[PDB]
Amino acid sequence: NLAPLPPHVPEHLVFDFDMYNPSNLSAGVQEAWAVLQESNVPDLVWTRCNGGHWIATRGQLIREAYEDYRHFSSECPFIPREAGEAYDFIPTSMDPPEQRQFRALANQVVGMPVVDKLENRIQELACSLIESLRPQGQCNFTEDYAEPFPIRIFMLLAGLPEEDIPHLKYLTDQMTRPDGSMTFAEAKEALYDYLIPIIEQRRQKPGTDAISIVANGQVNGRPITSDEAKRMCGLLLVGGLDTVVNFLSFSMEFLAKSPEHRQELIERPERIPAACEELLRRFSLVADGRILTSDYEFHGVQLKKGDQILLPQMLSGLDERENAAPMHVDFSRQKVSHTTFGHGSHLCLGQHLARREIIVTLKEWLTRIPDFSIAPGAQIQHKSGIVSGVQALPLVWDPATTKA
Ligand code: HEM
Ligand SMILES: CN(C)c1cccc2c(S(=O)(=O)NCCCCCCCCNC(=O)C[C@]34C[C@H]5C[C@H](C[C@H](C5)C3)C4)cccc12
Ligand SMILES: [K+]
């Protein structure tokens, strides 16, 4: 189904890109999205897919719309509209100025000083996961390392016992990949049923952990409500799962297919933090958006109040106006330009934790299993959406080349 073209939208801007099923998916998802940056494609287009919505295709427009929250509201941040409308996590669905207090609170639980403190526990977890795969000589990376890793980091952050992982993983999977057992709202409520009691207890007997902090917090000079804490705790849980899982998978897929890039990192592990940044550009993967708060002319184009606009974080760093030869991976780029963690008032609060997860993973993997490949015969499949990703990543190695 295409949606019929709204009258304010001129025909010459219409490019029916489908964000959940792009034409060139088989060639790689970032590549599939990069067709939007071909020379015949305007900086701002309308697609009739997925209810109909604008797409900003260039880093300059993407950044500008993200800065201008007065015209581009996060009240409805997801395409299609029905998803955007039912979405209530905090702070992702709030605009400044209200979002500012909630964000400061959330920053207390995942900000830089928390990350510096957790780094060693993160390394311990990574090492334990890798060392259990190492002798096998094979894994599905996405399933065997990537999925268990960030959920375990959330348990450590939130002071939750490891016993709860299976149930928690199931509920978050249902929100982003439903098997049918539960609607989004049922999964959401089950999450709330899970967090509500721990919130009440940690209100009464505080810990030094994320759930305590968010529960004992103050916003707008008053105590955070139970509805507000659970909706924040919800985002803190889901925000760092699918992004980390899929990003780690794009990265490992690249390194498996590029011996020369692996060898560089093996020989110069000091370049790993830079390599992380360049991978974050090349394999950027989020595409959310905004809704117009009013009629607005933006870069020659008449936008109407209530129109949705997709602003793909993914596209800014792939824009050849931002980075020369954008599909080329070069770990020594002088200026790595990207909006992989967003831009503007909602810039990812988990970005410092994500970078440490990524760096620790690459450092620990490359020192234990320096030599690996894509399993003989396998063709890696990508998926496209709000968070794009990797269906599966079967890796192989010779265990004699590994270090215990
Ligand atoms: C590769 C990993 C990650 C990527 C690419 C990523 C990406 C993003 C992006 C693009 C936004 C802005 C969304 C918007 O403007 O609508 C965002 C916000 C956010 N992220 Fe991440 N993220 C990652 C990891 C994490 C982690 C590990 C956490 C920890 C829980 C986290 C927590 C959050 C929170 C709480 C917000 C909302 C900030 C606000 O609305 O004020 N993220 N993220
Ligand atoms: C028929 N019709 C109209 C339809 C009906 C229903 C579904 C449809 C789908 S669809 O099934 O493919 N729709 C996708 C469901 C929306 C996913 C919700 C996001 C959850 C992750 N949330 C975060 O808050 C984390 C986080 C974390 C960070 C920051 C920010 C953005 C990203 C990255 C995610 C928040 C496709 C096409 C049509 C559909
Ligand atoms: K909403």
Curated annotation (Swiss-Prot):
EC id: 1.14.15.1
UniProt catalytic activity: 2 reduced [2Fe-2S]-[putidaredoxin] + (1R,4R)-camphor + O2 + 2 H(+) = (1R,4R,5R)-5-hydroxycamphor + 2 oxidized [2Fe-2S]-[putidaredoxin] + H2O
Pathway involvement of the protein, from the record: Terpene metabolism; (R)-camphor degradation
Binding-site residues, heme: C348
Cell compartment(s), UniProt: Cytoplasm
CDD domains noted in UniProt: P450cam-like
Cofactor: heme
Top-level enzyme category: oxidoreductase
Family designation: Belongs to the cytochrome P450 family.
Purpose of the protein: Involved in a camphor oxidation system.
Full protein name: Camphor 5-monooxygenase
Species in which this protein is naturally found: Pseudomonas putida (Arthrobacter siderocapsulatus)
